[PDB]
Design a protein around this ligand. Structure first.
Ligand SMILES: CCCCCCCCCCCCC/C=C/[C@@H](O)[C@H](N)CO
Ligand SMILES: CCCCCCCCCCCCC/C=C/[C@@H](O)[C@H](N)CO
Ligand SMILES: CCCCCCCCCCCCCC(=O)O
Ligand SMILES: CCCCCCCCCCCCCC(=O)O
Lengths: 58, 271, 252, 252, 271, 58
């Protein structure tokens, strides 16, 4: 059960391969490839949206 | 990955992007294109290295202590009650978040040194150490040869000198749904007693010793302990610690200035 | 919404909190010269973002006795960055402009300015047998001022406001593109001026084209305590500037 | 036909009666910066015909003892009309150039020049523990000269020709784009240089980019009676010049 | 792979391959067949070993320094501000190109030696070293036991003696689109200040130390640093350095002759 | 995700196999097999081609 992922390659111009050998998920290597991103939680917690090109205070 | 800057040109509208009301507690989502003529740029920059995991996922010394081959009873063995607050570096990083959940990769760097009352023909066989983890409640050792070192249940590592840093992985062993880096509360319902983060701290103790019994010449060994968070999840970010740390068990601080100063609000001379 | 406003030209943005509309030339919006209207045959330079941006001139203070001020374009911009450098190296040039006159007061203040752009504003000399001199006509980015009495001077411009320096009723300056800044309602005036001339292009040093005139018809007034320092700032942006006839630089 | 040549850029044309081909950069022809290669986000100015034209630098006289000359670009053009004015007002800029070196002699004259463009020509100081000074490095549109003996100076460039001021065999300057002017066959050299740098754009005052070097490998020679005044003129044209980061002018 | 030499025979034409005009700045593409009667040869020679990658891709010492087990405060630890110009060999190779882009493979050879004030019964446990890389701006160590050695974020290697050269790979860490080997410019827009390649040089500092604290007898360790470019891309080739190097931060040189000399243009005696 | 390439064998008279084990392309071995080659950039940068059998200067 080998897993083939993608290496960090760079941008203006390849895969790896991993097999887990231990019975415990804690033994696994790092999740260095998780790129989820949601600023909205902290940057726009306002209940009434807020459009940019609009008069902020009506 | 980051955003491309989309080309924009002249404007003469009644849409006012630059003007907002920060009172709302909302950060403006403005970009260059909104206030100037922009050219198009295909941006390839990635935010790979600022991911919480890559930020915390590097081994960091959290402590070290020493013990001696021979010399009797304090000296003989050492112990440390596990906690991440006795070092500045790591502690400040974890503390950028209120709660966190993660696995750990422990690595130990163990080194030995000779002490002065030397002796002749001193030719010591290689040293093997034993580190034992004693979960809260387990019978703790009282001298280098207490029965508890038989570890029928506590986990321990036996490692010999010259052979590469022993290492293990430990799961999220917390009893809550996350490790709390802050706790604005007390341990007792009557508020008497301890207050603060230490009320939560109960992760056990590490115990180390030499296995080969004391030889002629005295030797001192130091055990450096490394923590490396893995499989990290972090909630409720907070401001980075400003004031230096004073105590390991609380947030006590000496008031300190918000920044360094400069001569006037007009000085371009970077400090 | 709609009294608020944002204008971006080049690397500069202007915002207004209380305007009227934007008066546009004679309904004409500025545009580059067409092949059918052109006569100079060389390929023009049309720097763009480097020249068609907002230049902010010196400010001026409105006082309860100020009769008015005036500036002459392109002259006023002859020293502003690349717009000025292009004027120097070229025999010919043409451009339109977005003029934004600023002046905030308080709610307790009062007053009303006429902001007009007078195309081809030939001015009269104070002494009938002479011609005014270059400097009485235009002090560059520095406003010249009208006066509330007949100017005397042997080579000065007859600046008594009532005839706007042109021998006409100042009250009729209205057939020219204009707006008013009645402090009670406004705080700025924005006027887009297309290029108006009897030739497709012209030399920018020997001809002025249009003059901006700011004239208070109701004087600044306020009760004691209110701030007495009420500046009037003028920010202008060339639009669709092209030049032809490149050579060495200067006047002559 | 084909030894003859005509190049028009802007309002300027160059003609040649006896050339070779035109050497082109590293086979690359100059072009504006692509959105995929760009990093500075502001809209660039691309004056065109006003800046990408032929500027003729000061002439220099070739004598039977001249070791060689050199000029640094953009420096050499920092004072040439609008190209220079754009350099001043902008933080960043980039451009390519068509370099045309001229030198006519007679049929009875002889000599041969190496005309090279050396990208990134960091130079050594005459005295090992110092750095040469700005002026020893570049005298603007005025050529600096190599010497036929070790230069001494406390802050001068080690100009002995044999190491081309760089610590290398002058005879290997050949891996750089070049042409020769062997009076016997040629009379000019034309080299088009694309913009070469490790960044998409750069400041034009603090970085030189490439240096033009003209070095005689076979000395001017002639019999008595033949004219002894043989100038070498250098005409250059920026190509595809764009600038970014407009602000006030100057160095600093 | 190289070109076959195609067989050719007699000629009597008005096509003149041998005659050209080098003034054009163009190298002639002549081959034997153009000027003599050639036989056919199927050439199997390959240019595999002159590929830029195989040329640069061999580990090369770029520096070395020393530090001591005991002795106090300069001696105790060492540091090196990373740069590839302090060695002749590698430096001249990279310098055959103006710009280059590549990854690196660092290998360290660490060796230890005993110093004379010996002591009796000297029997030292194996030594473990720590090398820490401090990116520009990071708090730098001031003595063998400064807080910065806890490396919560800077990367470090801990290596024990007798166990095979520690090694890592580092990406193209440049901030431009390539590493510049030359820079005919200044660091300041007013041209005051530094001039030349050093204006670009800002790759951080390496810091090394012993981990086991000082024992009776003094020991000195030397750290040799090896660089091996990998995944190489190189632009704008230049003439190889003629004059020997004088300084690490610039191209300063003593004029030197183009070649060795011989008695006359007629001497076949190879020097 | 094993990659099989060809060894340098010699000419007048075989494959390898590689698996990458690291998440970063910089960890990969050398590109010792890239044989691209274009002298034209430096040997013939002349705008007007230049045929060999022809009179160089017309
Ligand atoms: C054989 C060796 C076994 C070693 C086992 C070590 C287990 C301890 C893991 C501790 C992870 C603790 C990180 C700190 C959490 C605290 O900040 C919070 N106060 C708890 O809520
Ligand atoms: C745990 C050890 C980590 C060690 C990290 C070392 C990072 C440094 C890599 C440097 C590569 C530099 C090669 C030289 C480039 C220079 O020539 C140029 N001046 C820069 O443009
Ligand atoms: C617990 C030790 C794991 C042993 C791993 C040996 C290497 C596996 C060979 C490849 C097999 C591919 C599919 C399975 O996995
Ligand atoms: C990150 C460590 C990688 C482990 C590699 C073990 C050997 C792979 C067995 C062969 C599997 C073939 C297809 C996959 O790859």
């Amino acid at each position: 059960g080998a897993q083939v992922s993608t290496q960090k390659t760079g941008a203006h111009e390849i895969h790896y391969t991993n097999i887990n050998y231990y019975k415990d998920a804690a033994s696994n290597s790092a999740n260095r490839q998780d790129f989820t991103q949601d600023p909205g939680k902290f940057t726009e917690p306002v209940k009434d949206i807020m459009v940019k090109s609009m008069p902020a205070l009506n | 990955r980051v955003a491309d800057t989309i080309g924009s040109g002249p404007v003469n509208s009644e849409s006012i992007p630059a003007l907002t009301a920060a009172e709302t507690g909302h950060t403006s989502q403005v970009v260059p294109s909104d206030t100037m003529q922009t050219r198009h740029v295909k941006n390839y920059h990635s935010r790979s290295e600022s991911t919480v995991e890559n930020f915390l996922c590097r081994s960091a010394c959290v402590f070290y202590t020493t013990y001696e081959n021979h010399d009797s009873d304090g000296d003989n063995f050492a112990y440390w009650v596990i906690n991440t607050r006795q070092v500045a570096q790591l502690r400040r990083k974890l503390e950028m978040f209120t709660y966190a959940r993660f696995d750990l990769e422990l690595t130990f760097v163990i080194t030995s040194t000779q002490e002065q009352p030397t002796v002749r023909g001193q030719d010591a066989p290689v040293l093997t150490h034993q580190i034992m983890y004693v979960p809260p409640g387990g019978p703790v050792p009282t001298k280098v040869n207490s029965y508890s070192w038989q570890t029928s249940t506590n986990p321990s590592v036996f490692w010999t000198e010259g052979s590469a840093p022993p290492r293990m992985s430990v799961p999220f062993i917390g009893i809550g749904n996350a490790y709390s880096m802050f706790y604005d509360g007390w341990a007792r319902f009557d508020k008497q007693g301890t207050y603060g983060i230490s009320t939560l701290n109960n992760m056990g103790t590490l115990y180390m010793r030499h296995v080969n019994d004391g030889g002629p010449g005295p030797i001192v060994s130091t055990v450096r302990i490394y923590f490396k968070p893995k499989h990290v999840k972090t909630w409720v970010p907070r401001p980075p610690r400003l004031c230096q740390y004073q105590k390991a068990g609380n947030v006590n601080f000496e008031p300190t200035g918000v920044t360094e100063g400069r001569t006037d609000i007009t000085t371009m001379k970077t400090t | 919404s709609d009294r608020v406003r944002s204008i971006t030209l080049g690397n500069s943005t202007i915002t207004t909190q209380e305007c009227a509309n934007v008066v546009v030339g004679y309904g004409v919006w500025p545009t580059y010269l067409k092949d059918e209207e052109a006569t100079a045959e060389d390929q023009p330079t049309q720097p763009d973002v480097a020249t068609c941006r907002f230049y902010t001139l010196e400010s001026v203070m409105w006082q309860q006795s100020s009769p008015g001020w005036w500036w002459k374009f392109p002259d006023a911009l002859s020293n502003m960055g690349l717009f000025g450098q292009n004027m120097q190296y070229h025999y010919l040039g043409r451009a339109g402009y977005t003029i934004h006159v600023q002046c905030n007061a308080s709610k307790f203040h009062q007053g009303c300015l006429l902001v007009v752009c007078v195309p081809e504003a030939e001015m009269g000399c104070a002494t009938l047998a002479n011609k005014p001199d270059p400097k009485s006509l235009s002090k560059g980015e520095i406003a010249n001022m009208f006066e509330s009495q007949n100017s005397t001077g042997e080579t000065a411009v007859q600046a008594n406001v009532i005839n706007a320096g042109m021998g006409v009723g100042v009250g009729n300056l209205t057939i020219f593109p204009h707006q008013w800044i009645n402090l009670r309602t406004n705080n700025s005036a924005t006027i887009v001026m297309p290029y108006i001339n009897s030739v497709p292009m012209d030399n920018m040093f020997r001809h002025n084209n249009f003059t901006l005139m700011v004239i208070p018809f109701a004087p600044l007034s306020y009760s004691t305590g209110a701030t007495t320092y009420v500046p009037i700032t003028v920010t202008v942006a060339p639009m669709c500037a092209e030049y032809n006839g490149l050579r060495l630089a200067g006047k002559q």
